[PDB]
């Protein structure tokens, strides 16, 4: 019933660039094994537990986020379902902690190696420690995406990564077949160490802001006479390409002597090779799918012919061209031919040899297309990322200038926006933001208007604002921007508004740098042109950098807006018949419509002590699924994905059913999916299935204490099972089953979880219970300091520590930064009132509850928040007064009472 705060340690993760994936078709083996060594572990720089973990990231790790995760504080690898991690003490997936049996282990040892095998073919994942057979192996794991070796660490640790076969020296011999190598890449870039999904990077002058990753890695890693002429010309061109090059003909095969055996006359051509020539000619003529006397005959030099009888000659019409895009299409045809060869060597040849091989080889094939066009003419025939500042940085008047530098030239927009900015909306789409995009060359307000010129690489852009006559000016390379119509970048009659805030939007794969004018000497421009006209930079002296709030792409459930365009929720009260319910209305029949919807309630349900946990999904009348009775913690949320369906639909009720845990949802239309959430949150187009499982066994090195895991119960779907093609109306309901209670005097879901009225049998709807519905894009605060992270296979030295204050939400099971409260202003008020209640309870001489509060809030938190200087200010004074009231106030009162009397004794020091 109250929000909790505590100090926690930052954790980060890094990456070697390795792509391992198995799927249908050709795959790069799938058996991979890597080992990583640590040389030391730091003892405890800070009052916290040092954590290092190694594992497999799969896709969408979310580990790089330096802030509040789902667990208490930050997360590394293995805390989520997508990531599998190992440190020694437990196997970690989805924030679980079941132990693993190892002989005499310290969980952090110096000069220790840890090995692991991917084992793509069999669903088990292999982990290797000296004399330690792993009890559990992860089963039923999704193969979508690419698997990554990923290391997660806290500060103070130095750790070495073995490169592999070329440089790494493994203490344990690999199991046969696992073939540890670098596996290369289609760009053939050298392997390097990088942070996974880095939004901010280090730069020469300040930090560099970059966009989202490209994530495109999911890929695998009449005419008959002309045809006869093309076949004989192809054989002649093979012999002639041999003639021009160093290849001298010889019946014996010798590459060092450049001998080519298959060189003979056209009438004496080898029949399989002749029909192979005709076969590639036919394949060519299939891939297009869209005279002879006049043609000249080219000569042949005496050096060209040394030994062979057949003297080849091209058609001597080699001086015109049509188009190189046809050559590009022919190169694509050769790429599909290479793909056919790869399929033949994958499914029929079982060969392993190096359309995504190398760009140089593709260009080589493009030039070695072998004048086919010449012969033919001789014959004749995720979301973008938005960065702004805090709402407290808004300015009403004055003249303000800031600078931007573009490292790369992509799709980026720069402008000023209102203090309230709607997320998940492109800049300039509405009246909120006045923005400009110079990639296409338009200003963007209520549509796009052609204005300005495109940028080159590495040019500065200055933004200039004036409020007295209300004009915003833009400057590139020290010159004022010029519109097509005219005027020197004048926006006429802008409203003063509640405020103005600089905003910048970056697309995928672009690097930029922002300058707010903290240092006047750092500014490369503005020295004269900004000076005069009364213009000043944004911040002459603030003694600290700005907050730089940023948009985050992560599905978090938020309450429904009171006024949505086509989504409303109505409360239906209980009558003398039927239970009360919540009904969903879509409206807006025509023009715009809905696409997809998934929504859950706003409360949870913890099980006792594991006792039963047999939440058998949709009992109806003898349910077939019979949901697994497992999961010790299982915080379950009544949830359903309603998809897309017209008219009145979805009416979630609350019926006791003498089940102590039953609900009800009757819909007349079609169907949906009534499931059960459990802190997962993952919106996907394939909502029919494809849920993350990754269940383990956790046996005892002999499949003794096995009994495989349940992989939670977040996928409690049922789809369109018990139904027909008749459809008609009223598709019944489904009672959300749970753990029953000892009652039955002759029970509702609302009776559960709600801190009393469990005994009361009557169903009721308290005002707390409401439907949220999921939103993809959120707003977050970038930290003011980032944790820091090249020989012998590379090594990383963590060094100095960082710590962060964490504020966890009880029901949501979600942690949040305490400084973000400055934007919330409701939880700030609640926390201030909670602090006031804490002071009032321990007010006058109650040292027992002072001890209780000192247990509730630690001394270290009070000492750390003393010098924060980033708190909103009411919380700061609240913590000051709490620290004063808990300990020092009583002695101060006693001394104040004693100060009045003056009782002096006789001592020689009193005489002096």
Listing from the earlier edge strand, what are the strands of the sheet with 803-809?
Answer: 4-9, 803-809, 814-817
Closest CA to 799 of 6, 162, 149, 10: 10
What residue has token string 């110079």?
A: 438
* Spatial contact of 17 and 190, defined as CB atoms under 8 Å apart: no
738/605 Cα distance (integer angstroms): 9
Q: Where are the beta strands (DSSP E) in 558-709?
A: 568-572, 581-585, 598-600, 637-641, 649-653, 664-665, 673-677
In degrees, rounded to 5, the angle at the alpha carbon of residue 882 between the alpha carbons of residues 876 and 885 is: 140
As given in the structure block, the two tokens for residue 214 are 């490209």
908/912 Cα distance (integer angstroms): 6
734/7 Cα distance (integer angstroms): 44
Closest CA to 16 of 194, 158, 201: 194
DSSP states of 212-279 as a string? ----GGGS---HHHHHHHHHHHHHHHHHHHHHHSS----SS-BTTTTB-S----STT--HHHHHHHHH
Cβ atoms < 10 Å from Cβ of 639: 23
780/548 Cα distance (integer angstroms): 9
- 795 CB-side CA count, 13 A: 13
637/605 Cα distance (integer angstroms): 7
Specify the length of the chain in residues: 912
In sequence order, the β-bridge partners of residue 207 are 202
**Distances in whole angstroms, Cα of residue 906 to Cα of each of 279, 900, 901, 903:** 123, 20, 16, 10
Breakpoints of the chain, after residues (C–N > 2.5 Å): 221, 290, 354, 381, 609, 746, 789
* Spatial contact of 444 and 416, defined as CB atoms under 8 Å apart: no
778/501 Cα distance (integer angstroms): 18
User: What 3-state class would DSSP assign to 39?
Assistant: strand
* Spatial contact of 404 and 463, defined as CB atoms under 8 Å apart: yes
H/E element, 797: strand 795-797
Closest CA to 104 of 137, 84, 138, 130: 130
Cβ atoms < 10 Å from Cβ of 894: 11
Closest CA to 514 of 589, 447, 552, 463: 463
Q: Is 253 exposed, middle or buried (0-12, 13-18, 19+ CB in 10 A)?
A: exposed
Q: Angle at which helices 324-347 and 271-288 pack, to 10 degrees?
A: 120
H/E element, 35: strand 33-40
673/598 Cα distance (integer angstroms): 9
463/529 Cα distance (integer angstroms): 12
* Spatial contact of 60 and 180, defined as CB atoms under 8 Å apart: no
> 620: alpha, beta or left, given left = phi > 0 and alpha = psi -120 to 50?
left
428/884 Cα distance (integer angstroms): 50
Q: Residue 297 carries which DSSP code?
A: B
How was this one solved?
cryo-EM
674/649 Cα distance (integer angstroms): 13
**Distances in whole angstroms, Cα of residue 478 to Cα of each of 125, 466, 526, 527, 528:** 59, 18, 8, 10, 10
As given in the structure block, the two tokens for residue 816 are 């949040």
* Spatial contact of 126 and 116, defined as CB atoms under 8 Å apart: yes
Q: Is the dihedral of CA 302, 308, 310, 316 positive or negative?
A: negative
As given in the structure block, the two tokens for residue 205 are 């002058």
H/E element, 504: strand 501-506
* Spatial contact of 285 and 277, defined as CB atoms under 8 Å apart: no
Closest CA to 804 of 825, 829, 783, 832: 783
677/485 Cα distance (integer angstroms): 56
446/457 Cα distance (integer angstroms): 28
As given in the structure block, the two tokens for residue 682 are 């993952």
């Amino acid at each position: 019933l109250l929000l909790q705060t505590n100090l926690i340690n930052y954790v980060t993760s890094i990456r070697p660039n390795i792509f391992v994936g198995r799927a249908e078709g050709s795959t790069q083996y799938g058996k991979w094994y890597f080992e990583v060594m640590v040389d030391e572990v730091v003892p405890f720089l800070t009052a916290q537990a040092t954590h290092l973990r190694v594992g497999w990231a799969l896709t969408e790790g979310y580990s790089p986020y330096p802030g509040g995760g789902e667990g208490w504080g930050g997360n590394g690898v293995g805390d989520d379902l997508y990531s599998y991690g190992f440190d020694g003490l437990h196997l970690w997936t989805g924030h679980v902690a079941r132990p693993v049996t190892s002989p005499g282990q310290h969980l952090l040892a110096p000069e220790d190696v840890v090995s692991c095998c991917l084992d793509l073919s069999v669903p088990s994942i292999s982990f290797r420690i000296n004399g330690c057979p792993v009890q559990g192996v992860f089963e039923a794991f999704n193969l979508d995406g690419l698997f990554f070796p990923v290391v997660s660490f806290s500060a103070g640790v130095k750790v070495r990564f073995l490169l592999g076969g070329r440089h790494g020296e493994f203490k344990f011999l690999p199991p046969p077949g696992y073939a540890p190598c670098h596996e290369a890449v289609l760009p053939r870039e050298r392997l390097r160490l990088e942070p996974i999904k880095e939004y901010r990077r280090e730069g020469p002058r300040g930090p560099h802001l970059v966009g989202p990753s490209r994530c495109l890695s999911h890929t695998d890693f009449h005419l008959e006479r002309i045809r006869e002429k093309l076949a004989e010309n192809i054989h002649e061109l093979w012999a002639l390409t041999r003639i021009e090059q160093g290849w001298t003909y010889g019946p014996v095969r010798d590459d060092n002597k450049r001998l080519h055996p298959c060189l003979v006359n056209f009438h004496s051509l080898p029949e399989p090779e002749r029909n192979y020539n005709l076969q590639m000619s036919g394949e060519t003529l299939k891939t297009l799918l869209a005279a002879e006397d006049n043609l000249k005959k080219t000569k042949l030099p005496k050096t060209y012919m040394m030994s062979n009888g057949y003297k080849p000659a091209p058609l001597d019409l080699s001086h015109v061209r049509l188009t190189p895009a046809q050559t590009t299409l022919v190169d694509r045809l050769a790429e599909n031919g290479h793909n056919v060869w790869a399929r033949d060597r994958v499914a029929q040849g079982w060969s392993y040899s190096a359309r995504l091989l190398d760009e140089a080889t593709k260009r080589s094939n493009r030039d070695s297309l072998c004048q086919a066009v010449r012969t033919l003419l001789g014959y004749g025939y995720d979301r973008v990322r938005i960065f702004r500042a805090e709402k407290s940085y808004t300015v009403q008047s004055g003249r303000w200038y800031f600078e931007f530098e573009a490292v790369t030239t992509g799709e980026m927009r720069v402008g000023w926006a209102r203090p309230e900015l709607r997320p998940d909306v492109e800049l300039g789409a509405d009246e909120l933001a006045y923005v400009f995009n110079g990639h296409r060359g338009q200003r963007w307000h209520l549509g796009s208007e052609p204005f300005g010129r495109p940028w080159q690489s590495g040019d500065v852009v200055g933004c200039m604002i004036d409020l007295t006559e209300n004009t915003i000016i833009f400057t590139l390379n020290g010159e004022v921007l010029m519109s097509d119509s005219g005027s020197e970048t004048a926006f006429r009659e802008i409203e003063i508004g509640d405020g103005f805030l600089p905003v910048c939007s970056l697309g995928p794969g672009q690097v930029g740098h922002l300058n707010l004018g903290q240092d006047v000497s750092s500014l490369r421009f503005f020295a004269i042109c900004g000076l005069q006209e009364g213009f000043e930079p944004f911040a002459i002296n603030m003694q600290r950098p700005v907050t730089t709030w940023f948009s985050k792409s992560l599905p978090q459930f938020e309450p429904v807006p009171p006024e949505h365009p086509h989504y409303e929720v109505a409360r239906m009260d209980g009558t003398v018949d039927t239970p009360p319910c919540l009904r969903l209305a879509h409206r807006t029949w025509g023009s715009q419509n809905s696409l997809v919807e998934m929504l859950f309630l706003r409360l949870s349900l913890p099980v006792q002590f594991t006792t039963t946990y047999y939440y058998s999904v949709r009992v109806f009348a003898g349910q077939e699924p019979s949901c697994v009775w497992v999961g010790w913690v299982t915080p379950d949320y009544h949830q359903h994905d309603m998809n897309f369906d017209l008219s009145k639909v979805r009416a979630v009720t609350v019926t006791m059913g003498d089940e102590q845990g039953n609900v009800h949802s009757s819909l007349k239309c079609x169907x949906x999916x009534x499931x059960x959430x459990x802190x997962x949150x993952x919106a996907x187009x394939x909502x029919x299935x494809x849920x993350x499982x990754x269940x383990x066994x956790x046996x005892x090195x002999x499949x003794x204490x096995x009994x495989x895991x349940x992989x939670x119960x977040x996928x409690x779907x049922x789809x369109x099972x018990x139904x027909x093609x008749x459809x008609x109306x009223x598709x019944x309901x489904x009672x959300x089953x749970x753990x029953x209670x000892x009652x039955x005097e002759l029970m509702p879901l609302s009776a559960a979880m709600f801190l009393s009225e469990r005994k009361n049998p009557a169903p009721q709807c308290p005002p707390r219970l409401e439907v949220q519905m999921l939103m993809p894009v959120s707003w977050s605060r970038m930290p003011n300091h980032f944790l820091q992270v090249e020989r012998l296979g590379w090594a990383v030295q963590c060094q100095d520590p960082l710590t962060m204050m964490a504020l966890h939400i009880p029901e949501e099971n979600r942690c949040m930064d305490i400084l973000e409260l400055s934007e919330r202003l409701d939880l700030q008020r609640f926390h201030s009132h909670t602090l006031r209640l804490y002071r009032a309870v321990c007010a006058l001489g109650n040292n027992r509850v002072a001890h209780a509060l000192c247990s509730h809030v630690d001394q270290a938190q009070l000492l750390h928040a003393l010098e924060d200087a980033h708190l909103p200010g009411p919380l700061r004074a609240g913590y000051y007064d709490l620290l004063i009231s808990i300990h020092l106030e009583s002695a101060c009162r006693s001394r104040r009472s004693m100060l009045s009397e003056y009782i002096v004794p006789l001592t020689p020091e009193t005489r002096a």
